[PDB]
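Quick bug: Myosin light chain kinase, smooth muscle output formatted oddly.
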Amino acid sequence: GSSGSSGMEVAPSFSSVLKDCAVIEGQDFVLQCSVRGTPVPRITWLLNGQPIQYARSTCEAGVAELHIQDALPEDHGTYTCLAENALGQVSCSAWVTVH
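Here's what came back:
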């Protein structure tokens, strides 16, 4: 036998990666996805480059969300949601379009 305890940590992963989405200039759009892991991986969104500073992201029940109000024509790019923890590290990309 071997001593052990139930309820061990886990590595980060994306069950439902982000998908393409379109929105009208001036409208609101929140990027919702699914990510698992333990402990909860760090959620940081970036605009095809540097991380966002005015992002009120909200991770609940392993659900990373990013509310983006005032969809500007200069936002149309590729949102990257990095998720890493003491266990592993993973990242995903997305494609948001602004009419």
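Actually, after a second look the formatting is fine. The two ends are 62 Å apart (CA to CA). Closing.
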